[PDB]
Amino acid sequence: MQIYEGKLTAEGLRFGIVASRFNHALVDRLVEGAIDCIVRHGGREEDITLVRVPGSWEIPVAAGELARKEDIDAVIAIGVLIRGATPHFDYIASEVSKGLANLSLELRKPITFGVITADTLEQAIERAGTKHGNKGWEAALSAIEMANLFKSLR
Amino acid sequence: MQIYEGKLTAEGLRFGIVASRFNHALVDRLVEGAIDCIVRHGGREEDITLVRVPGSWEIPVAAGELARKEDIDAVIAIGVLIRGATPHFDYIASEVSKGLANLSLELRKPITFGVITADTLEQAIERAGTKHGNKGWEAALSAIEMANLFKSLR
Amino acid sequence: MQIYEGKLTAEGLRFGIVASRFNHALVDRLVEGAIDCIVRHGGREEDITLVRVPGSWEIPVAAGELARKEDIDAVIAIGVLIRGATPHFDYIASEVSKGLANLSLELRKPITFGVITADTLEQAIERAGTKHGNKGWEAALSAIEMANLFKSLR
Amino acid sequence: MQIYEGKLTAEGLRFGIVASRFNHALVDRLVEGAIDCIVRHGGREEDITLVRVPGSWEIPVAAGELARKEDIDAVIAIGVLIRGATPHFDYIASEVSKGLANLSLELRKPITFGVITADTLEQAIERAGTKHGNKGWEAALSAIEMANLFKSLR
Amino acid sequence: MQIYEGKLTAEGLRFGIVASRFNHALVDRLVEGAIDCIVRHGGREEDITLVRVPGSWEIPVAAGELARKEDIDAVIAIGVLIRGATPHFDYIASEVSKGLANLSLELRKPITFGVITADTLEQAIERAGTKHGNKGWEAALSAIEMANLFKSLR
Amino acid sequence: MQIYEGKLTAEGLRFGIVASRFNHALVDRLVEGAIDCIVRHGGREEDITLVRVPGSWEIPVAAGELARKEDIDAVIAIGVLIRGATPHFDYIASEVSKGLANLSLELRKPITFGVITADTLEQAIERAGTKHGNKGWEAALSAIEMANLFKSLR
Amino acid sequence: MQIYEGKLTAEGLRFGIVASRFNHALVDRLVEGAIDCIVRHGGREEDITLVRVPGSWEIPVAAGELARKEDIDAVIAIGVLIRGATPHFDYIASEVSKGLANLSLELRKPITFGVITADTLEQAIERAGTKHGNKGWEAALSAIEMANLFKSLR
Ligand SMILES: O=c1[nH]c(=O)c2[nH]c(=O)c(=O)n(C[C@H](O)[C@H](O)[C@H](O)CO)c2[nH]1
Ligand SMILES: O=c1[nH]c(=O)c2[nH]c(=O)c(=O)n(C[C@H](O)[C@H](O)[C@H](O)CO)c2[nH]1
Ligand SMILES: O=c1[nH]c(=O)c2[nH]c(=O)c(=O)n(C[C@H](O)[C@H](O)[C@H](O)CO)c2[nH]1
Ligand SMILES: O=c1[nH]c(=O)c2[nH]c(=O)c(=O)n(C[C@H](O)[C@H](O)[C@H](O)CO)c2[nH]1
Numbered sequence A, B, C, D, E, F, G: 001m002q003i004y005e006g007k008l009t010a011e012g013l014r015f016g017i018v019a020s021r022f023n024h025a026l027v028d029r030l031v032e033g034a035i036d037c038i039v040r041h042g043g044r045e046e047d048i049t050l051v052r053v054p055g056s057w058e059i060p061v062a063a064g065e066l067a068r069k070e071d072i073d074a075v076i077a078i079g080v081l082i083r084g085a086t087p088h089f090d091y092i093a094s095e096v097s098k099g100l101a102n103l104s105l106e107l108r109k110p111i112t113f114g115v116i117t118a119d120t121l122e123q124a125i126e127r128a129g130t131k132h133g134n135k136g137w138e139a140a141l142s143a144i145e146m147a148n149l150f151k152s153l154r
C-alpha cells in the first residue's frame, strides 16, 4: 500500500499567519501559540509571515494573497468569533470558513483553521490558551504536518 | 518575521460604498458613519463613490461593478436586514454575505461587511448609531485598514 | 462624491420574468403585480418576456437563459415556497436563492428576488397581494431601479 | 409580451434518470413513477437512460456525466434521504441539492429534483407512491416540461 | 432502456483513501473497514494509496491531490467529527462535505463520504465498527461501485 | 455657522497615558489598545509618555502631573475597577472619575476616560479587548480627536 | 535573564514507555499515540523501549528500572484507571502518581504522566484517542520537551 503522511519537524518550512484584531486579547494568545509551535518544532521565526486584518470577515482575502506566494508552504488562519445577540456571527463564521476552505482547494495549498467560533466568551477563553488548549498552536501543528505531506503529495 | 498590516490614515484612498434603501431610516445612519469615518481619517469625500440599490439582495451585483474599478481601493457594503415572520431574512442574509465574500476573493480586493443582520428592530437601532455603535463606521474603518494593507500585500 | 442611483421610470426597459407554477393561485397574483408595476412605471408590456417553469427549483436554470440575452436588462424571479412537513422546503429555498444570486454575479446583470419563502399558507397569502403587499410588484420595482442604475454603472 | 412555456407531451424527448440504492424499497417506487410518467406522456422507454448509484451522495457526479451528453434533454435525480440520529442527513441533503442545482446552471440543462428529504420513514412512504403522491413522477413531469421549454429557450 | 450500473467486484481497481487523525481511535477502525472491503472484494492492497491528514478540515485539499491522479479510480474520505460545546463542528462538517462534493464534480471522479458527523461519542462508536456498522466499509463499497460504473459512464 | 471638530489623524500629537497596575492582566490589554490606536492613526510611539501607578485611586494625581506638561496634548486614563463585596469600589470609582474630570477643566486640557468600572470580572474581560471592544483603544481615539479639536479651540 | 526550555524535535532521543494491560483496549490506543508522537517528531522507533506490566499499580516499579538506565532520556507512564464501586481506584491512583513523581525526583530524570484517572468509562474513551485527545501522545510530547530541556539543565 502506498502511504503518504507528514512528519512534525518544521525545519525549512515557511508559514503565513493571518490574524484578525477583533477580540485581540484572545487572538493574541492564539498567535503566540502558533509561533511557539512553529519555532519549537524547528521552523525559523524569520520564515513566518504575519498579516493582521480587522476581523474574521477579512481573513480570507488576506489569506488568498499569502497562499498565492510561492515561498509560503501553508497558511494558518487565526481569529476569534463569539456569538452576539444577532445572527451576525453565523453569517461571518459561515463565510470565513467557506472562504478559507475554497481557497485551499483553488490554490492546492494547505490553509488550516485556527478560528474559534464560540457561543460564549468563556468558551473562547477556554480555547485561547487555557483549559481547552490553544487553537493557534493546533492550527500551526496541522500546517506543519500538511506542508510536510505536500512535499511528496503535491 | 515579516509583518504586514494596514494603518488607519486614509490619505489618497478611494472607496466604493454600496447602500440599500430598504430600512433606509437606519441605513442612512450607517452611510453617515461610513463617510464620516473616511473623511476624518483623511480620505477625501471626492474619492468616495456611493451606489444606492433597492435592498440587501441587490448589494452584491452592484458591489461587483464597483470592486472591478481599478480606481476603487476597497468597497464597503451597507444594508439593514431585520427578521420578519418568514425565513425570507435568512435566504437574503445568506446570499448577500456569500456574494460579497465570494466577490472579494474573486477580485482580490477588500470588500467589508457593514450589513446589519438583526432579529429585531431594537437590535438594528442599537447598531445604527446608538448603543452598540455604527456598523457603517466600523466597516469603513476596516476598509481603510485593508486598503492600506493591500498597498503592500497585493 | 460620485453618486450612482437608479430612477423608477421604466421607459425603454426590457424585463424577463421567470415564474413557477407550483402554488400558482398565489404565483399568478405575483405575476400580475410585476407586470402592473412595469407597465404603470412606463415599461411596455411587449418588452416583457415571461418564462413559466414547474417549480421554484427550476427557476434558476431558466433565469440563466434569460439573463444571458443581450436585450434583457434585468430578470425578476417569481415563485412561492411554503414549508411542508419535511425539510424539502429548506433545500429548495436554499438552492433557488443561491442560484439566482450566483447568476446575477456571474452574468453581471440584476436578477431580483420575488420568491416568497413562507412557513405558512397564511404568510404566503399575505405577501401575494394582500396585507403585506405583493412581492412580485416589489421585485419588479427593484428590477426597474437596478436596470436604470446599470445604464451608468455597468 | 413574449411567453415561453413547455408543454407536457414527451414525444421525441430523451431523459436521464440517476437513482440511488440506499432506501431502495422506496427509491424503486420513485423510479417506477418517473418511467410511467415519461412513457404515458409519449416518451419512448428506449430513450430513457437509467444510472444506479449507491446513495444520494453519489447522485451528483453521475448526473454530471449524464447531463453532459448531447443526446440527453434533461436529467431527473431520484433518491430517498431519511433523517437518522446524527446530522449526517443534513450534510448529504445539502450537498446533493447544491450539486444538482449547480450542475444544471453550469451545463445549462434542466436537472429536476426527485429526492425525498424526510424527517421520518412515514414521510418518505407518503411521498413514494402513497398519500402524498410520487416524487419520481413529479420530477419526471417537471423534466418533460423543462425539456420542451428549452427547445425554444436554450 | 439504457441501464448503467457498477458491480461490486474490485479486480484491477485503484483507490485513494484520505483519513484524518483527530479521533483516531475511531478513524482507525474506519480505515480497517475500508481496506478490508476493498481487499475481500478483489482489490489489491498494493493498489490502495492512503494519505493521512490532521483533521477533517484537511481532508478535502488532500483528496483533491489524490483525485487528480490518473491512476486513482475513486477516493474514499474518512474522518470522525463529534460535536463539541461550540458550533466549531458545524463549520468544519459543512466545509468538509462541501469540499469533497465540489471536488468530485470538478474532477468528474467519484469521491465517497466515510466521514462520521456525530452529535455524541456514543453515536461515533456505533458507526465505527459496532452496532451501526462501519462507515469506512460503506464508503469503500460505494467507491467500488462508482469506479466500476465510471468504467462505462465516464 | 462656525463648526469646530477634531480629525482622527494623529501626526505630531503627543500623549500621556496613566495606567494602574491593579487588575493588570486586563489593564495591560487596554494599554496595548491605546498605543496601537495612537500609532496606527499616525502618532509616533516616541511621543507617548506612559506613567504606571498602583491602582485607580492613584491615577488622578499622576494624570495631573502629565496634563501640566506643555508638550503633552492630551492624557488618557487607563484602569480596571471591578466591584468587590464592599462599597470600596464605589468610593474609588467616584473619586477617580471626579478627579480626572476636574483636572481636565482646571488645566483646560483633554483627559479621556479609559477606566473600566465593572460589576463583574466577565464585564471587565468583555471591555478589555474582547466582545465589547477595548476601552483603551476607545479612550485613545477620543484623545486624538480632542487634541486635534483643541488645536483650533484652545 | 537566563532562559532554559526544550524544543520538540526528538532526533537522537531515547524513550522508555511503561504501559499496563488492565483496560488494554484503551491503553493500547495511548501506546499508539505515544509512539506516533515520538516517531513523527523525529525520534527513532528503535530508540524506544516498551515495558508491559499488569496494572497501573505495577507501573512505578517498572518505570524505576527504566529510568535508571543511562541510555534512557525520559520515561513515559501509560495506563488507564477507571473508578469502580469501591475506593480501590483511589488507592491505586494515589500510589501510581506518588511513585512516578517520587522516582522522577530521586533519579533526576523526567518521567511523564500519561495515566488516565477517570470516573467513567466514557471519560476514559474521550481521553484515549477521541474527543479529548490522546493522553499517550500528550505524555510523549512532554517527555520530548523534558529530555531536550534536560540536555542543558541536568
Ligand atoms: O473576528 C471577529 N469576531 C467577532 O466575533 C465579530 N463579531 C462581529 O459582530 C463583527 O462585526 N466582527 C467583525 C467582522 O469580522 C468585520 O471586521 C466587520 O463586519 C467589517 O467588515 C467580528 N469579527
Ligand atoms: O435590505 C433588506 N432588508 C430587509 O430586512 C429585507 N426584508 C425583506 O423582506 C426584503 O424583501 N428585502 C428586500 C430584498 O433585499 C430585495 O430588494 C427584494 O427581495 C427584491 O429583490 C429586504 N431588504
Ligand atoms: O415552487 C415550489 N414551491 C413549493 O412550496 C414546493 N414544495 C415542494 O414540495 C416541491 O416539491 N416543489 C417543487 C420543486 O420546486 C420542483 O419542481 C420539484 O422538486 C421537481 O424538480 C415546490 N416548488
Ligand atoms: O440516499 C441516501 N439516503 C440516506 O438516508 C442515507 N443516509 C445515510 O446515513 C447515508 O450514509 N447515506 C449514504 C450516502 O449517500 C453515501 O452513499 C455514503 O456516505 C458513501 O459515500 C444515505 N444515502
Ligand SMILES: O=c1[nH]c(=O)c2[nH]c(=O)c(=O)n(C[C@H](O)[C@H](O)[C@H](O)CO)c2[nH]1
Pocket (backbone or CB within 6 Å): A111, A112, A113, A114, A138, A139, A142, E020, E022, E023, E054, E055, E056, E057, E058, E079, E080, E081, E082, E083, E084, E088, E089, E092
Ligand atoms: O476530524 C476532526 N473531528 C473533530 O471532531 C474535530 N473537532 C475539532 O474541534 C477540531 O478542531 N477538529 C480539527 C480540524 O479538523 C482541523 O484539524 C483544525 O481546525 C486545524 O485546521 C476536528 N477534526
Ligand SMILES: O=c1[nH]c(=O)c2[nH]c(=O)c(=O)n(C[C@H](O)[C@H](O)[C@H](O)CO)c2[nH]1
Pocket (backbone or CB within 6 Å): F020, F022, F023, F054, F055, F056, F057, F058, F079, F080, F081, F082, F083, F084, F088, F089, F092
Ligand atoms: O484599580 C483598582 N481596581 C480595583 O478594582 C481596586 N479594588 C480595590 O479594592 C482597591 O483597593 N484598589 C486599589 C486602590 O485603587 C488603591 O491603589 C489602594 O486603595 C491604595 O491607595 C483597586 N484599584
